[PDB]
């Protein structure tokens, strides 16, 4: 018969899912940024530019004011409209003569004799064009479009575990187990060798696997515990849908107190553990201790949940069981993000190198 | 006694191997290629070259025909033979005057006054030499030699699971369990506390762990199932070698319906799960439920497979159990491949940057 | 009742820790080095320098001797003191006229007419300044400070498993189980539903989970074995602290014969397996088969270890259980190291590219 501790294996596998919910899934390697370094290179270039170039960014009546493009439209014989926003952003702090003179001294361009200034200008313009071409690589905007946020991932994990965007509180306010469709008895709710369960998410599957009820508390209801049964008082023959207090006494078997540094491999290993504990029969696959007939919670039957989507002839969990598919989506999005962070590293490092060379007065003369 | 579900843990571990066979192990991150970008840079260089350089690649009697090196041997006072193949490939489409004039307009070299053309040529020749030096890095050809194919990996996994290069079909045509050496009784086939098994691969180990036979179907033969025993009809005291129908009723407990994105970590975790379920005794290590004496399939004995290669005094599975060693080889080859893909990324990104600069007419003047 | 094989799951999880101890945790991807390539670039630069520059590194009375900076202090009107150590290291082999003439021929600078030499010098000086700026990136010294050693990691793993810096030998010389605090009886030592254990490390936890004693050898003492019980003879009601022979008969259930290529993911999966097998009760969490009351080793009680640090209301193992926290530290240090190796790759590849260009006589003329 099924007794104390018999479902420890399944509980561990399901809790490895549950623990990733709430706001515990953390995205560490995050937005690798190079825009400040690029902006610094662009502003160095504008500072080094001839004063008649900076003058194009000034209002005709007030030298300290940025040019208005209705007041002074850009010349049509130029590609200036294609670059004006970035140029004007570089020029704005420089419209102040005190800020500009400071930047010239800071970048070591002050006092440079004309020929030496020309050669410094040439190297800076070359390095700036190189910085733009590295920062504007297509696999940069692509990589950028592949990055997600801790937020988006957290919401999708909560969907697979709770069919909700946020984890329900300790009383499970707003939550209704089994999507409101629980009826009749435990085996109708949790499934059998011939019928699928009503559990569409990870939390309700854990409830089928681990909840005691009013008849098994002294026996099979201890499958996931050691000392005492969860004590739900679940009476599915009278009130099929369990209460939030009932659900929380099962959730507290899992670690909802820590955090997990998300990783596609972490998600994979957890999904694989659940998926391969599925016992494939002719009509259903069963997760949990199972002796005979159905997942009624009786010590002679089963403490388990059943799925019709995978069998000994068809189905793969991360594609055909909806809640495991949704969690596989998080792994997929984590992989893309992880590769992007790696790809966005090269421009970042190269732009730092360029900014260092642009501030080396000796190099500016050599590379000219 | 051993009964329904007692081997779910071991089945899950073994099926995590079996599911990687057939053509389900997929290599995602594949050949990172930069040869098209390099070829484009080389053809840009040839187009920009002086017309008397392109003329060296033409037949003396037909300007549209490539030079024949028997008809017109290359000068010995040059390193031209060391570069001719790549140069001739760049020059071939350019031998057509219409294609060449188009490429000149496309690369924005047409109409350039002589001094501006010379400076553009200088920058392109410099960028092309840089592209070659990046593309010809030694850790590029090395990385290239470390890359494998989904095919080679799939064949080695099928060797560890089936001792064959392809997964046997549903009737196991062409396959003979236990390499034709099964004899006497189940315990002679599957091993004991004193003797090793006849199972040399993963599939036959799963058979020892999970097959019912004609005597245990109502008891220990349900160790890996829920509702019904596999129903092999295996009668090893009369016909020791099971049939293909018998083997398939056990294989269908595993997920042969999906695919796995291969990963050294995936392989590691799966090998580690199997290896540490091995129960180390003085003379053998046992995988599977074991109560007494041997792996006979009796409810009082064992549903298991034994190996003499590892014990409580010696042996490590991924080195001393042949089938686990072969699968560790796939992990090793996956690691090399994964690092190579990463190393081949840098040349790829740099060549894209160079091609962008070479097509920027403003940069070609600045960098000269 | 608890019997043969009932703790195989827990043993596998704990042995996955134990196997990482001793000197079996191997750091593969190790120090990515670029200093030899940098030193080669710096020495190429010094060789190409004007002879009057090399002369600054010579003693005034002996041209073959390095300048002494007390004898001939460096000029104050220069930044020479900021670069002298690296310059002098590049110059030292060149003070020998035969070595210098050889290096000039080797780098193909001999016989170069003056204008061609000047242009070669210009390109080499530019490439050398670029090499320095890449090699001196801040995320290089940072990455360098993040790298650890197989040694440091091995010592911290041995702390989590043994509370010692090295793994005890087969007789456990120098080791005292349970930090010398074992007393009274098995349940006082290994814990209960109300009390924590005396086991502060991984080895002593495995002892609580898997050791037989003088009363359970024929029953619960076989929870982690197949054929024969470990045979400790442990008699905690008389001599609470087990002997080294006793401890070794339990350790030999784990694989101490191989090696593991360390990986944060490897550590994570192993920590997660242990952490989620912890059965959370109101006052303790229990690892191991548990039927009633305590971890006394009786077949009706438990073969297990208990922790008060995590419960069904608080605690996360990798932060609140000291030995699991220490092992999580190894994972954290492995992640930093793995990212560093990746970041230190870019300078390495770029310096190889520069050294190749500096040795290409054709490029030295083009890039001038
Ligand atoms: C770092 O800082 C530097 C400055 O130090 C900055 O350089 C500036 O770059 C921009 C963009 O590359 C340059 O913009 C060019 O400006 C010229 C000059 O236009 C003025 O002068 C002419 C008289 O010669 C007037 O007619 C005109 O009204 C302006 O007052 C333009 O002629 C250029 O436009 C032509 O070329 C473009 C291609 O580059 C075409 O897209 C465009 O349609 C124009 O084509 C015309 O001329 C072509 C000549 O080849 C011809 O083929 C076409 O048929 C057509 O007739 C261009 O807009 C600007 O001058 C630079 N400033 C200085 C002081 O050098 C860098 O941009 C900055 N780096 C970064 C990355 O921010
Ligand atoms: C991008 O596109 C450019 C063109 O825009 C292309 O440039 C070509 O590069 C190749 C390889 O670098 C150059 O090949 C050289 O050609 C000269 C010229 O040979 C002709 O003219 C001489 C008369 O001066 C005739 O005697 C001869 O028969 C040819 O008609 C050769 O002299 C060069 O060979 C010498 O130097 C090599 C080292 O670079 C040696 O390996 C070789 O043995 C030769 O050594 C001889 O001269 C040495 C002088 O230093 C001397 O030391 C030796 O003792 C010996 O006497 C070389 O083959 C070619 O000219 C370039 N073309 C143009 C138009 O510039 C790039 O290759 C292309 N980029 C890429 C990456 O594809
Ligand atoms: C690769 O190999 C090359 C050689 O091929 C090597 O180049 C050497 O680089 C160093 C460092 O960049 C150069 O050092 C400079 O040396 C000059 C010359 O000093 C001598 O001559 C003057 C007379 O002109 C004497 O007065 C003096 O006593 C020496 O005999 C120095 O003048 C330079 O110092 C000034 O500039 C530095 C900034 O770069 C300041 O930090 C320093 O305080 C000095 O400032 C003074 O002059 C400034 C002028 O702008 C002025 O603004 C200040 O107020 C102040 O008055 C500097 O030390 C050396 O000359 C190069 N050698 C050659 C032959 O070219 C590369 O270093 C090497 N690459 C690598 C990476 O190893
Ligand atoms: C589960 O199976 C037991 C044993 O046959 C039976 O008593 C229950 O009614 C059933 O749900
Ligand atoms: C396995 O062990 C059982 C129980 O002792 C015995 O009956 C079988 O004959 C043996 O193979
Ligand atoms: C463990 O529990 C058993 C069964 O109740 C009891 O006999 C032992 O004394 C206790 O330690």
CSV table of N, CA and C and ligand atoms in Angstrom, one decimal, chain B residues 1 187 290-302, ligand 5:
chain,number,residue,atom,x,y,z
B,1,UNK,N,8.7,-7.1,-0.5
B,1,UNK,CA,8.9,-7.7,-1.9
B,1,UNK,C,8.8,-6.5,-2.9
B,187,UNK,N,18.7,-14.6,-14.0
B,187,UNK,CA,19.8,-14.1,-13.2
B,187,UNK,C,21.2,-14.3,-13.9
B,290,UNK,N,16.7,-4.3,-5.4
B,290,UNK,CA,17.4,-5.5,-5.1
B,290,UNK,C,17.2,-5.8,-3.7
B,291,UNK,N,16.6,-7.0,-3.4
B,291,UNK,CA,16.4,-7.5,-2.0
B,291,UNK,C,17.3,-8.6,-1.6
B,292,UNK,N,17.6,-9.6,-2.5
B,292,UNK,CA,18.4,-10.7,-2.1
B,292,UNK,C,19.0,-11.4,-3.3
B,293,UNK,N,20.3,-11.8,-3.1
B,293,UNK,CA,21.0,-12.7,-4.0
B,293,UNK,C,21.3,-12.3,-5.4
B,294,UNK,N,20.2,-12.1,-6.3
B,294,UNK,CA,20.5,-11.9,-7.7
B,294,UNK,C,19.4,-11.1,-8.3
B,295,UNK,N,19.6,-10.8,-9.6
B,295,UNK,CA,18.6,-10.1,-10.4
B,295,UNK,C,17.8,-11.1,-11.3
B,296,UNK,N,17.1,-12.0,-10.6
B,296,UNK,CA,16.3,-13.0,-11.2
B,296,UNK,C,14.9,-12.6,-11.7
B,297,UNK,N,14.5,-11.4,-11.2
B,297,UNK,CA,13.1,-11.0,-11.5
B,297,UNK,C,12.1,-11.4,-10.4
B,298,UNK,N,12.5,-12.3,-9.5
B,298,UNK,CA,11.6,-12.7,-8.4
B,298,UNK,C,11.4,-11.5,-7.5
B,299,UNK,N,10.2,-11.5,-6.9
B,299,UNK,CA,9.8,-10.3,-6.0
B,299,UNK,C,10.7,-10.3,-4.8
B,300,UNK,N,11.3,-11.5,-4.4
B,300,UNK,CA,12.2,-11.5,-3.2
B,300,UNK,C,13.6,-11.4,-3.6
B,301,UNK,N,14.0,-11.3,-4.9
B,301,UNK,CA,15.4,-11.2,-5.3
B,301,UNK,C,15.7,-9.8,-5.8
B,302,UNK,N,15.4,-9.6,-7.1
B,302,UNK,CA,15.7,-8.3,-7.7
B,302,UNK,C,15.1,-8.1,-9.1
D,5,LIG,C1,16.1,-14.4,-5.5
D,5,LIG,O1,15.8,-14.4,-4.0
D,5,LIG,C2,14.6,-15.0,-3.7
D,5,LIG,C3,14.3,-14.8,-2.3
D,5,LIG,O2,15.3,-15.3,-1.5
D,5,LIG,C4,14.7,-16.5,-4.1
D,5,LIG,O3,13.4,-17.1,-3.8
D,5,LIG,C5,15.0,-16.7,-5.6
D,5,LIG,O4,15.2,-18.0,-5.9
D,5,LIG,C6,16.3,-15.9,-5.9
D,5,LIG,O5,16.7,-15.9,-7.2
